[PDB]
């Protein structure tokens, strides 16, 4: 599908509210496998199960290993911009 930019707003006491799977070591992008109800990703409205996370706040995630992506994603705070695509 088309590449999309999506804004997520998160408070500091919360996580992102997604599960991710995949990563470079598996030969696939970082993929959203779950959107947890009522948490920030669900609330933002623009992120879906099956989306590949291409970048977050300008950080490319296209060639990142799973745990690299976890560290990068979990470091983001506040107003967080995602670049995503559904294939």
């Amino acid at each position: 599908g088309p590449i999309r930019k999506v804004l997520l707003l998160k408070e500091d006491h919360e996580g992102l509210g997604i599960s991710i799977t995949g990563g470079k070591e598996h030969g696939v992008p970082i993929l959203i496998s779950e959107i947890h109800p009522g948490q920030p990703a669900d609330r933002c409205g623009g992120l879906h199960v099956g989306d590949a996370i291409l970048a977050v706040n300008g950080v490319n995630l296209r060639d990142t290993k799973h745990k690299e992506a976890v560290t990068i994603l979990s470091q983001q705070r506040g107003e967080i911009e995602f670049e995503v695509v559904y294939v």
């Binding site: 599960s19 991710i20 799977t21 598996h26 779950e34 799973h66 745990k67 994603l73 979990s74």
Partner: peptide, 8 residues
């Protein structure tokens, strides 16, 4: 399940 999954 071959791939890692993390809740974040």
């Amino acid at each position: 399940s071959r791939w890692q999954t993390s809740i974040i």
